[PDB]
């Protein structure tokens with residue numbers, strides 16, 4: 001059905017969704033479902049001229065994300081022949097039974113679109129829902145939660161979007177848009193300070209963060225006025241000490257805790273005064289939110 | 298942007314679709330490289346540096362995706378890498394067990410590693426969760442199967458990982474088997490009518506029909522349905538369903554699904570049903586924690 005309508009492109013861009021990446025994801029997903037042939041079940045049991053109303057409804061409480069992409073799927077499958085009666089916005093809180101979308105379209109085309117629409121909605125809503133749980137554990141502090149490059153293959157930009165819809169902040173998108181010095185770079189470079197100085201000199205225009213595993217490495221990069229330091233697998237007490245040394249250096253380096261973190265210790269870490277938590281699980285281990293598509297009776 | 302014959306051979310020996318795997322790998326590398334080169338490593342790691350690297354598990358689980366991770370490394374290095382040691386997909390790993398030992402240019406490992414690990418940790422996570430469902434079903438004849446609730450773009454690799462965890466696949470897509478769902482019956486008005494229409498249309502294609510009530514079950518058992526999916530039946534309703542199937546004396550295979558979770562898996566396996574269809578295997582599998590250490 002080759003590409004959807006410009007109205008759908010505008011809705012994707014209005015939402016901050018990368019439209020070319022979303023097209024690749026959608027076209028690929030439909031292909032996974034249709035490469036063995038037409039929908040035999042529906043073609044045998046549903047008339048070609050049937051049209052129906054359908055409701056996308058949540059079965060669990062959580063945060064909605066990906067509804068513009070699901071509409072792009074339906075737009076593509078129907079060639080634009082659908083009408084929306086009702087829709088919630090990405091970022092909205094849903095409870096069980098809440099209706100996220102009500103649409104009318106040819107019944108056979110809804111049956112083809114349904115599973116691709118839901119696989120996208122449920123995963124992205126699951127990401128935004130988990131992100132919101134982490135963000136809520138940070139209430140009462142100024143701490144924020146951030147994601148990582150531990151995304152699922154092919155879904156990076158959509159999952160980064162979902163993290164934003166859940167109240168999280170995006171970490172860098174790839175290897176070339178920001179520096180993140182890690183232990184292999186510190187070993188190679190000769191010290192934490194040497195790696196930090198080499199990165200600053202090689203690409204002075206990029207954001208620069210250095211990950212440390214010890215308080216000794218932290219002292220080095222504070223002495224060089226690093227803008228942002230990732231504290232790798234620090235205990236809560238080591239974070240308090242790290243924050244103490246940061247406050248005394250009066251460089252106002254941002255501190256980001258990472259590694260060894262779970263939702264039940266997130267509030268404890270935020271209380272130490274670190275500025276950020278970096279959480280891989282937001283994208284690599286987010287349980288899907290259970291949404292279903294139900295035809296009108 | 299092509300890998301070696303040795304990799305095509307590896308993927309085929311494993312039963313992995315190579316064209317799909319190429320699409321997944323190339324797409325995933327582009328996600329990481331579209332903003333420019335690995336500026337961090339280019340500033341700090343010598344261009345001539347070479348290192349051995351170990352993929353090791355931090356947690357117990359089942360390995361899956363290792364030939365795909367090697368295809369990533371093959372592409373990034375242009376074939377310039379040495380394998381010293383490898384486990385096989387489907388092997389059980391414990392903490393510290395070494396899945397893979399390779400030697401390559403250090404900068405190329407640093408470009409390859411996160412793509413390799415995103416694939417390896419996800420697919421091993423799918424296989425690991427599948428294996429836990431299989432363990433809960435041990436001592437019964439009930440088997441676990443997956444579904445079309447796969448992450449977009451990852452269907453064939455995720456279905457592969459379910460098999461490596463000891464699970465069954467059913468339909469790969471919409472076209473390869475008939476599965477009459479609740480929405481088909483809503484649209485038609487009758488579960489028995491939908492079954493007969495499907496049977497008539499393509500007599501040799503096996504029909505599975507999904508029911509939500511014991512009265513619907515009665516209706517399709519009377520028509521001699523070959524396979525019935527019990528949608529959101531409780532444990533007690535499945536026992537009742539097995540009873541009515543036995544009383545109707547049909548050979549109908551019974552499958553249960555609908556929000557199934559691991560803490561009730563072992564109970565559902567003792568209802569008499571033949572299969573549990575579990576969406577969570579593919580849409581809610583926690584990643585297996587694997588790391589790559591120089």
Ligand SMILES: O=C(O)CCCCC(=O)O
Pocket residue numbers: 114115118291292293478
């Ligand atoms: O949408 C389909 O084609 C199958 C969906 C199975 C029912 C569900 O959403 O739980």
Ligand SMILES: [Cl-]
Pocket residue numbers: 016164
């Ligand atoms: Cl935004």
Ligand SMILES: [Cl-]
Pocket residue numbers: 171172178207
């Ligand atoms: Cl950044």
Ligand SMILES: [Cl-]
Pocket residue numbers: 312460
């Ligand atoms: Cl196999």
